[PDB]
UniProtKB/Swiss-Prot annotation:
GO biological process: cellular response to virus; lymphatic endothelial cell migration; plasma cell differentiation; T cell costimulation; xenophagy
Protein name: Galectin-8
Site (Critical for binding to sialylated and sulfated oligosaccharides): 57
UniProt xrefs under CDD domains: GLECT
Functional note: Beta-galactoside-binding lectin that acts as a sensor of membrane damage caused by infection and restricts the proliferation of infecting pathogens by targeting them for autophagy. Detects membrane rupture by binding beta-galactoside ligands located on the lumenal side of the endosome membrane; these ligands becoming exposed to the cytoplasm following rupture. Restricts infection by initiating autophagy via interaction with CALCOCO2/NDP52. Required to restrict infection of bacterial invasion such as S.typhimurium. Also required to restrict infection of Picornaviridae viruses.
Listed GO CC annotations: cytoplasm; cytoplasmic vesicle; cytosol; extracellular space; membrane
Keyword match Cytoplasm: yes
Record keywords, A-Z: Autophagy, Cytoplasm, Cytoplasmic vesicle, Lectin, Repeat
Lineage of the organism: Eukaryota, Metazoa, Chordata, Craniata, Vertebrata
PROSITE patterns: GALECTIN (PS51304)
Domain Galectin: 17-150, 159-289
Amino acid sequence: LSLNNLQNIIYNPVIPFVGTIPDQLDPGTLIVIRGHVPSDADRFQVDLQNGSSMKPRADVAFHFNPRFKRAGCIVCNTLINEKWGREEITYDTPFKREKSFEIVIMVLKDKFQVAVNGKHTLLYGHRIGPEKIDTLGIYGKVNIHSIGFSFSSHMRLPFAARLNTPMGPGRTVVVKGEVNANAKSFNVDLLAGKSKDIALHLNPRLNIKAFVRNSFLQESWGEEERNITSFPFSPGMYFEMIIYCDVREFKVAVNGVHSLEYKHRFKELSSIDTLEINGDIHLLEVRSW
Ligand SMILES: OC[C@H]1O[C@@H](O[C@H]2[C@H](O)[C@@H](O)[C@H](O)O[C@@H]2CO)[C@H](O)[C@@H](O)[C@H]1O
Ligand SMILES: OC[C@H]1O[C@@H](O[C@H]2[C@H](O)[C@@H](O)[C@H](O)O[C@@H]2CO)[C@H](O)[C@@H](O)[C@H]1O
């Protein structure tokens, strides 16, 4: 989505910019580009290239070229052995002079998918294998504020985020990831933003094989409850954890099977507006419904 999903982000590169992509463009990979088009813009381009050689000019797997004229458009093409391929023009350009934009390039198995300002713009079939793309170039009249990446790898820690919709009965938070091969423990916290206290602290401890959960209220930890019919976590084990909010307590499940219930100690459910995750895991995805 916004920032907890990026593993790498660069601000204000000078144009022309030619930089190495920090990881492979694997399917599901997201490249987010934010900037604005100057008032005198005639054209600019985002090129995903194999290398950065200028002689011979490095192959351009995917040339994204917004052009500004009476019938604004985006010209896409591929360059092989210094020669251009079949030109693909998308008209009704989303881009406009003196306006800012957000470009989201999603890497797919067989093509690139591109959305601008949250609206689908075009698809581009792979002409060069994306494994071969290792550098991103930006040229022309365009100002880039930031570029960011979200590889299919894991997310970076710590993970801190506000939850779009307030916490309340029926509200769900699902977390997916993998416990590190040599994990000790990790935690998943639901906090009251301002208060800065913790409504629900889920802390699985692998070294002690126990699931500690507690509440942090009034600048202090409460009475811990570890009772459980079966430790759901194992070092190196993939998992999905669903935290369901009910009227009387939280219901927590792991890999499709219920683990435990935690009666509410922080009664103002609607005030629980922050999710925090940390510890010995590879966080793969966080979803609050
Ligand atoms: O095809 C991408 C490539 O287009 C070049 O311009 C084209 C132009 O669109 C067309 O009208 C003309 O007949 O041929 C030119 C060369 O193929 C751009 O110069 C180049 O930078 C890419 O944008
Ligand atoms: O209540 C959860 C809270 O536990 C803290 O650790 C405790 C530990 O559980 C207890 O056995 C020991 O005697 O004292 C420790 C004091 O911290 C964690 O440090 C904290 O992060 C929470 O997980």
